[PDB]
Design a binder for this molecule. Structure first.
Ligand SMILES: [Ca+2]
Ligand SMILES: [Ca+2]
Ligand SMILES: [Ca+2]
Ligand SMILES: [Ca+2]
Ligand SMILES: [Mn+2]
Ligand SMILES: [Mn+2]
Ligand SMILES: [Mn+2]
Ligand SMILES: [Mn+2]
Lengths: 231, 231, 231, 231
């Protein structure tokens, strides 16, 4: 079958395996820093970074019908200078090889008002299509999440996320954990790949600050991934 | 370091790697059937099976302070002839090498009213120390769960469970999923091994029917496990 | 399918996963010491230790015809007080669950002059059925190796061995390496399991000193193993 | 640390993970076909293909001194229309990111008469610097192998190769196996990466036909790889 995996405890600046977009950049310290921030450490409004993984992923195969299974994990935080005023969020996702960034702020650089994406979002800001409070969601080829759940967030604290997709059931599952707070959320729903994405995709993250406010920074510290594409 | 892993898609009757206790037995079909049932398929009250994995697990090391990390997964169902009347449940756990079964019914063969166990229970029946409704819990050296969460159960449907223990934080996390229902629960809390168990343990399951009612059968279909004990 | 794996960088004295036989014992230092030795460090003639791994291994399945694949690695040395006078050797092997030791000296505790073993031997001493010089051999249900190759040995130096069995071809392959000497041997031949062993076996090592001379000590420092039994 | 792995049972034509050079191309059948061949199936002289793996590999790290370990395996054949007349061979290797092909025929597209390569060659043709007979060799930053061993080749038969590099000893080991012939060769020597390659490299294969004769075709059927870069 087809196999791939990768794992990093830290990010190496100017690493030839990640592809950076927008404001996205890797620090000396070793963080994937998605959004732009002030020397004061403050986030800057209307910011938006994306970050891809160079090798492409054969997610499903047309001749054989075969569908991959896969899993991904990451350590991430966010910094919010004013917790009463957040936005806009962070997503993990999969798109097509030549994906460039869409709309910002509430679109988390993924969708536009009027392009073949599957994603899991961690939304901080209640848009028109949003539910109340921060949440986690599954976006299948659209920004209006097909399912959501509250997101019990904590500022400046480390979140450990885990995403799994089980080809067998077409069941995607996302869980988030604040060990710092012994806190946990889970969300699950079925998604069909064979019809919402292309045989080969690329993966990564997207994150966006407030359109008209700073909102919160979005740094990613670790990344892990593996996939299996049976014949 | 120390490594171990194992994985089964099915159970082989009379397999020399699992140790059966009580009513516990493996069917031809390939199920680990924990509790006793009528030819009519019905569960029989005051039933109780346990099931262990032969090789012992070096969970932590005294000389070096080192603590393992580990993870386990399983497919399991339960059969309840009358869903208004359930009990008593199923636990996954770790105990000491020479562990034999404790009390039944509400003790899930793990504790006695007055012995060095860490477990995750899926309790169906509201005992004195229980919270309302079915739940999932973390029992550290006792039957009174240190944390719980609702358990969104479904009769006769397949549940996929995942348990992880992260030595780094001493954070144990349990999640359950009904893909059949696109349903999900998670529970997390910190637990100290070095003080609630012995350097070497054995793992397995325990399950129990109604004391005075049939309650529900408890079959396990798959098992997966892996551990890492750094130096 | 069926999976198992284990890995140790060191041996823990009195570990409940290994089963010791004969003179076999684990030192404080962390070595699996197979044969008996003088305080002077000298080997003692007519010595013989064996060492097993507790969990049993489902090597092949009768109902389904399925055959495992597997691989094993180890760091081992030998100490010879007089290199002109060696014997008798070390083997790695697989036998049936209830295997106890056979004949010593030239039988490496595996065979008797007149019991269901597959093994790879590292023979130091030219017996009647031996080829000239030290060698490596594949013994299928007998002490008369079906194939051999020279063994370019070095006293007191670390050897890294690797053994692989490819169910697909029934091809067993053994390689030995002295990184200290940038030295290497390989041997390969086909072996049928389904007819030379039982569905379930146990694995381990066997080693033996000179019958009437000290010969050489045989210590094992690390062990690694993994198996896969498809359906 | 840094981890990567990949595995293919077959090659997918026009796959976005492999980079093709020269005559190198992937067939419908699923073979990586390195050299050009006649409809009659014949190889064509002065042919030369190379093939790379897109993601780059962090082989060693300057700040931390750290060196990777790695391993690779492949199924490969060659077709020789006239076995008395062979050339020129196949190599596996690692080079720098922007590597393009060097000289052909006896240089296996790797070196030029007067560029930072480590490779393992399977040479069919006795050049000026060659030893007698086909052989296997380790080329550290040059075409004159630092070590060789006979290569017991068989035309049109499947060879299974395995390459390992153990950072701990700086010991590279290569083994080749013809299960069809129950045949085996091994070669090992120490190599310093930190001084013969760049922190980041790319890997692949190179293969070349006769300069003035057809020689032999060189197809690769499978590929496997994994690396670990500790901190
Ligand atoms: Ca929103
Ligand atoms: Ca209860
Ligand atoms: Ca002998
Ligand atoms: Ca040559
Ligand atoms: Mn949303
Ligand atoms: Mn309870
Ligand atoms: Mn012999
Ligand atoms: Mn050469």
């Amino acid at each position: 079958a087809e196999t791939v995996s990768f794992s990093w405890n830290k990010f190496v600046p100017k690493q030839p395996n990640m592809i950076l977009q927008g404001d996205a950049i890797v620090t000396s310290s070793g963080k994937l820093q998605l959004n732009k921030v002030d020397e004061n450490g403050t986030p800057k409004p209307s910011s938006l970074g994306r970050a891809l993984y160079s090798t492409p992923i054969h997610i499903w195969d047309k001749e054989t019908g075969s569908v991959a299974s896969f899993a991904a994990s990451f350590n991430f935080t966010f910094y919010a200078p004013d917790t009463k005023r957040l936005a806009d969020g962070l997503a993990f996702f999969l798109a097509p090889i030549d994906t460039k960034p869409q709309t910002h702020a509430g679109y988390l650089g993924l969708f536009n008002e009027n392009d073949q994406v599957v994603a899991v979002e961690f939304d901080t800001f209640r848009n028109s299509w949003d539910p109340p409070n921060p949440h986690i969601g599954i976006n299948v080829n659209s920004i209006r999440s097909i399912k959501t759940t509250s997101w019990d967030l904590a500022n400046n604290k480390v979140a450990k996320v885990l995403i799994t997709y089980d080809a067998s059931t077409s069941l995607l599952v996302a869980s988030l954990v604040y060990p710092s707070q012994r806190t946990s959320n889970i969300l699950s729903d079925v998604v069909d790949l064979k019809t919402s994405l292309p045989e080969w995709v690329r993966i990564g993250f997207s994150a966006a600050t407030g359109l008209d406010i700073p909102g919160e920074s979005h740094d990613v510290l670790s990344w892990s991934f593996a996939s299996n594409l049976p014949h």
